[PDB]
Amino acid sequence: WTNTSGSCKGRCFELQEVGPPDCRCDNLCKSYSSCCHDFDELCLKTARGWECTKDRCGEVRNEENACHCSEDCLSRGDCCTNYQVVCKGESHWVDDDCEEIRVPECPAGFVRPPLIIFSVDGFRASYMKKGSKVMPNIEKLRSCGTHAPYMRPVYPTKTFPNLYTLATGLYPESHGIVGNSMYDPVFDATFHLRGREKFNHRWWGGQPLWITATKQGVRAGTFFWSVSIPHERRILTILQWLSLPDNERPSVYAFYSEQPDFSGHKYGPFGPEMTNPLREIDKTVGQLMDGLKQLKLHRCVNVIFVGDHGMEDVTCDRTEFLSNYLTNVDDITLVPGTLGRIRPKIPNNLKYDPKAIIANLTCKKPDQHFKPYMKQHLPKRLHYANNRRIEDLHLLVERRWHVARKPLDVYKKCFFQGDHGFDNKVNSMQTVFVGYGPTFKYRTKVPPFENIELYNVMCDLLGLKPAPNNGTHGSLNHLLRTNTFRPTLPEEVSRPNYPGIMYLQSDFDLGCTCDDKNKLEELNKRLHTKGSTEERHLLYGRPAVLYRTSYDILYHTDFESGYSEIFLMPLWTSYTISKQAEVSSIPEHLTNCVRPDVRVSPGFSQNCLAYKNDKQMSYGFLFPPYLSSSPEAKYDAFLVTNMVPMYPAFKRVWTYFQRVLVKKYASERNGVNVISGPIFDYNYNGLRDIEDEIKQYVEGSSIPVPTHYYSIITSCLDFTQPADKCDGPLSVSSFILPHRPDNDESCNSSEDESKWVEELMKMHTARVRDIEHLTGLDFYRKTSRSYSEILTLKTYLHTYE
Numbered sequence: 112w113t114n115t116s117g118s119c120k121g122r123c124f125e126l127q128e129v130g131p132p133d134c135r136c137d138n139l140c141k142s143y144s145s146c147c148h149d150f151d152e153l154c155l156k157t158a159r160g161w162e163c164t165k166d167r168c169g170e171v172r173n174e175e176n177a178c179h180c181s182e183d184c185l186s187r188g189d190c191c192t193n194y195q196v197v198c199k200g201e202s203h204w205v206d207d208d209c210e211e212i213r214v215p216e217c218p219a220g221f222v223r224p225p226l227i228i229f230s231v232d233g234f235r236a237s238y239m240k241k242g243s244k245v246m247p248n249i250e251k252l253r254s255c256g257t258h259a260p261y262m263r264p265v266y267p268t269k270t271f272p273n274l275y276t277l278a279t280g281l282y283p284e285s286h287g288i289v290g291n292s293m294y295d296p297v298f299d300a301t302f303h304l305r306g307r308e309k310f311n312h313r314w315w316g317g318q319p320l321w322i323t324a325t326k327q328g329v330r331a332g333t334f335f336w337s338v339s340i341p342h343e344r345r346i347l348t349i350l351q352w353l354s355l356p357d358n359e360r361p362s363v364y365a366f367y368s369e370q371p372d373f374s375g376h377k378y379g380p381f382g383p384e385m386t387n388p389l390r391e392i393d394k395t396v397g398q399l400m401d402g403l404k405q406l407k408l409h410r411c412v413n414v415i416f417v418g419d420h421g422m423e424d425v426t427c428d429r430t431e432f433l434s435n436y437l438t439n440v441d442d443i444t445l446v447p448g449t450l451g452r453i454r455p456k457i458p459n460n461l462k463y464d465p466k467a468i469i470a471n472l473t474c475k476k477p478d479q480h481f482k483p484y485m486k487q488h489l490p491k492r493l494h495y496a497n498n499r500r501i502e503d504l505h506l507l508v509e510r511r512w513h514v515a516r517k518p519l520d521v522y523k524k525c526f527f528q529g530d531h532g533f534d535n536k537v538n539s540m541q542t543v544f545v546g547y548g549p550t551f552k553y554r555t556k557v558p559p560f561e562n563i564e565l566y567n568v569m570c571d572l573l574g575l576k577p578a579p580n581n582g583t584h585g586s587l588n589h590l591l592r593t594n595t596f597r598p599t600l601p602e603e604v605s606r607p608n609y610p611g612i613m614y615l616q617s618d619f620d621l622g623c624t625c626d627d628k629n630k631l632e633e634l635n636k637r638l639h640t641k642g643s644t645e646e647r648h649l650l651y652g653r654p655a656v657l658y659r660t661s662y663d664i665l666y667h668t669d670f671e672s673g674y675s676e677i678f679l680m681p682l683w684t685s686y687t688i689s690k691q692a693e694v695s696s697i698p699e700h701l702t703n704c705v706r707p708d709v710r711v712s713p714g715f716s717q718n719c720l721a722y723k724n725d726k727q728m729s730y731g732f733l734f735p736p737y738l739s740s741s742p743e744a745k746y747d748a749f750l751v752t753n754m755v756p757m758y759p760a761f762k763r764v765w766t767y768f769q770r771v772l773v774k775k776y777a778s779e780r781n782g783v784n785v786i787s788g789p790i791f792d793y794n795y796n797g798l799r800d801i802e803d804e805i806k807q808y809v810e811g812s813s814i815p816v817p818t819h820y821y822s823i824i825t826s827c828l829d830f831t832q833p834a835d836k837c838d839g840p841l842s843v844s845s846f847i848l849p850h851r852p853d854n855d856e857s858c859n860s861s862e863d864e865s866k867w868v869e870e871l872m873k874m875h876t877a878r879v880r881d882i883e884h885l886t887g888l889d890f891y892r893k894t895s896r897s898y899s900e901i902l903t904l905k906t907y908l909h910t911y912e
């Protein structure tokens with residue numbers, strides 16, 4: 112219970128931690144219905160608006176006014192933000208020329224530049240193009256500070272998951288806010304945008320910035336604002352807090368605006384009605400900058416202008432209905448709209464039949480505008496599976512469309528033309544980032560990056576040590592003038608062996624057969640020694656193994672590999688394909704050829720008998736026989752230590768990748784270096800499985816079956832230089848392909864591979880960093896580039912938009 116009869120006199124927007132029965136006066140009291148009776152009259156003053164006029168200059172201080180134009184207001188810290196312009200002949204901040212801020216210019220008493228995070232809801236990156244015509248203050252921040260062309264939100268691309276991701280550096284599956292609405296089966300409780308349940312701390316995991324700051328002795332302003340507090344009051348409050356005594360003043364501040372999201376939903380992103388809310392936001396930014404200038408702080412504070420997601424054209428007319436596919440939709444609950452999450456209406460309903468549901472939802476219309484996925488089958492880049500609040504059954508919805516349970520759930524007259532929530536690589540979902548201030552660079556454009564990276568950077572800006580999170584610390588050092596984080600290479604845990612010849616073909620009984628033999632490499636005395644293999648096929652040093660295991664480096668004319676004696680296959684296989692390289696066939700007599708590897712014990716080798724027994728599993732090769740340098744060298748490709756288990760369904764994709772796509776990439780990029788390998792993630796947590804976690808093996812054997820296969824394709828950013836002779840920065844694209852027994856995911860898979868395989872790979876694009884998590888490997892350790900630049904490279908996602 113709260114004793115409302117208290118008073119907010121001398122307590123308006125206090126940073127005091129005040130708990131019941133005491134009366135509250137903070138920017139969240141209205142949300143808890145715990146404000147003092149006089150909060151609204153003392154703290155939410157509105158009299159005479161938010162701007163000084165000429166007739167108010169030098170007025171007698173009336174404490175009834177929203178803001179002041181009295182002579183004393185400046186030292187009192189509560190002038191209207193335009194006071195000095197109207198009453199003292201100063202210019203607005205926006206009319207001032209841009210000038211580099213090389214060090215903080217702060218008043219005495221300021222020990223460090225404060226950080227102000229200005230968040231705008233639903234600010235699509237492309238709105239920035241409207242420029243100073245519409246948003247002159249924001250355009251000044253963008254052009255004079257540091258900007259990205261866009262920032263990638265997390266999936267789902269909705270507000271709650273993204274705001275909390277910004278605050279924590281975590282994927283939603285980790286922080287727990289996996290949607291604006293969610294059901295937790297252990298709580299048996301439902302979280303909603305609106306309502307009280309979301310105020311319970313049990314939903315919110317990880318460690319948000321304000322907590323990290325507080326725990327390390329840095330004072331945070333209250334980040335959240337009750338929706339009823341107008342933006343002008345939020346700004347005036349931030350400015351007042353900045354005028355506080357040295358021993359009370361916070362170091363970090365957050366402003367939030369619900370626009371331009373609301374107008375985007377109403378009018379769509381390209382609606383002419385969008386100009387008005389963009390102008391209003393800019394006006395708020397201007398009030399903040401004008402205010403900071405009045406406090407002599409405009410060359411002291413770091414400002415981050417950041418959005419949570421974008422906005423797409425979505426209308427009633429583009430709604431898919433599950434009732435068109437399923438017989439009894441009244442028995443399921445659907446989290447609907449720009450994504451789908453399905454569970455039974457009655458929790459744990461025993462009659463719930465997910466396989467039959469998915470079957471009815473799979474490629475049933477030629478123009479179907481969503482695709483069903485068990486969550487472990489979602490593209491790994493989405494990182495959206497490892498949480499009990501994420502339903503097993505998901506629908507990835509096509510941009511511009513909605514999914515709904517049945518037509519009763521749509522009300523045409525419809526009232527909306529915009530929405531968001533889609534796959535976070537969709538262009539319309541991208542949002543904004545600008546950094547302005549002493550610690551940011553001046554007039555600098557940076558490549559787009561993911562919002563999970565910002566928490567580390569805000570920690571850097573504040574001198575904080577970040578809690579464990581999913582950013583890669585150092586990958587954004589290029590945004591900063593100083594306060595960069597000097598990263599340190601992780602230490603290799605397992606050193607490799609370099610086995611020579613220690614066995615004879617007679618030592619092997621694996622059930623393998625090869626109809627021909629290369630008797631010439633048996634006269635090769637330097638066969639499978641290092642030679643120039645490493646400098647040709649391993650351009651950036653060997654991957655470090657960051658876990659305890661046993662593996663062997665194996666050399667070949669056409670490739671090198673790191674063969675695991677535990678998992679019975681390479682952890683990685685690395686090779687370079689020149690622009691001019693030739694594709695060749697697998698000769699008829701070699702179709703079923705598999706050769707034992709004298710370098711590796713028969714005990715640490717797979718056996719072809721298992722593959723003859725398993726009627727469902729087949730096999731493939733990591734280095735492709737199609738790309739052998741010579742008919743002689745091609746024999747290396749058929750080694751048992753280059754072999755991996757693949758379903759025939761997957762082989763349709765992999766062979767087309769090996770035979771057509773790799774050469775296509777080499778042609779277009781002036782040669783490519785490829786590293787390919789297996790991934791084991793049976794518990795779908797995005798992390799390398801331990802042996803105990805692997806759940807499937809080749810029939811009657813102990814050869815483990817990968818859940819995915821990766822490939823990392825690197826070339827010279829300067830495409831005029833061949834990949835193997837690159838002087839400067841690198842260019843990378845990667846994939847994590849799901850290893851599945853069918854191609855149900857690809858609706859056109861009945862057709863030739865040229866009609867569907869690339870479309871699949873694009874969906875499963877990945878960061879090198881993703882692969883590192885999944886493999887326990889560390890790539891690019893030996894290059895001519897800074898470690899910070901390499902970290903940037905590893906976080907890059909090739910999106911194909």
Ligand SMILES: *[C@@H]1O[C@H](CO)[C@@H](O[C@@H]2O[C@H](CO)[C@@H](O[C@@H]3O[C@H](CO[C@H]4O[C@H](CO)[C@@H](O)[C@H](O[C@H]5O[C@H](CO)[C@@H](O)[C@H](O)[C@@H]5O[C@H]5O[C@H](CO)[C@@H](O)[C@H](O)[C@@H]5O)[C@@H]4O)[C@@H](O)[C@H](O)[C@@H]3O)[C@H](O)[C@H]2NC(C)=O)[C@H](O)[C@H]1NC(C)=O
Nearest residue numbers: 284285286287315316317497498499579580581796797884
């Ligand atoms: C993204 O980065 C994060 C942060 O580093 C990584 O997540 C971490 O992974 C490790 C390895 O599995 C986990 O270590 C385990 O910790 C548990 C005990 O963990 C408890 O205590 C920690 C510390 O206070 C706390 O963070 C944990 O919070 C989890 O559980 C809470 C209550 O259920 C929940 O509120 C919170 O959201 C979070 O849940 C998430 O993680 C759990 C797994 O712990 C998962 O089941 C859930 O679905 C969410 O994903 C928890 O109270 C020990 O018992 C183990 O032995 C082991 O040491 C960390 O717990 C985990 N940290 C967080 C914050 O998630 C991700 O791996 C990384 N992803 C990628 C792909 O790189």
Ligand SMILES: *[C@@H]1O[C@H](CO)[C@@H](O[C@@H]2O[C@H](CO)[C@@H](O)[C@H](O)[C@H]2NC(C)=O)[C@H](O)[C@H]1NC(C)=O
Nearest residue numbers: 112113114115116117118119132133134147148
């Ligand atoms: C709720 O708040 C009111 C106002 O603070 C409290 O009223 C005061 O109570 C004290 C002690 O009984 C009196 O001496 C004062 O005269 C009261 N102050 C005013 C301004 O009226 C009231 O006690 C609180 N109720 C509780 C504690 O449950």
Ligand SMILES: *[C@@H]1O[C@H](CO)[C@@H](O[C@@H]2O[C@H](CO)[C@@H](O)[C@H](O)[C@H]2NC(C)=O)[C@H](O)[C@H]1NC(C)=O
Nearest residue numbers: 436437438439440464466467468469470471472
């Ligand atoms: C999947 O779709 C089929 C139709 O393609 C549904 O089959 C109908 O189901 C009812 C009862 O099972 C039958 O009486 C109808 O004759 C069927 N319709 C037709 C035209 O075949 C099936 O119910 C759907 N499955 C689920 C789980 O929704």
Ligand SMILES: CN1CCN(C2=NC(=O)/C(=C/c3ccc(Cl)c(Cl)c3)S2)CC1
Nearest residue numbers: 230274275277278334335336365366367
């Ligand atoms: C439905 N909802 C209304 C309120 N809401 C918020 N109101 C605020 O004042 C918020 C401040 C904020 C500002 C920055 C960050 Cl990083 C975070 Cl986590 C929160 S967030 C979220 C969307």
Ligand SMILES: [Ca+2]
Nearest residue numbers: 792798799800
């Ligand atoms: Ca795992």
Ligand SMILES: [K+]
Nearest residue numbers: 722725726728
């Ligand atoms: K077979």
Ligand code: NA
Nearest residue numbers: 854855857860
């Ligand atoms: Na198919």
Ligand SMILES: [Zn+2]
Nearest residue numbers: 232233270419
């Ligand atoms: Zn939003």
Ligand SMILES: [Zn+2]
Nearest residue numbers: 233372376531
């Ligand atoms: Zn919205």
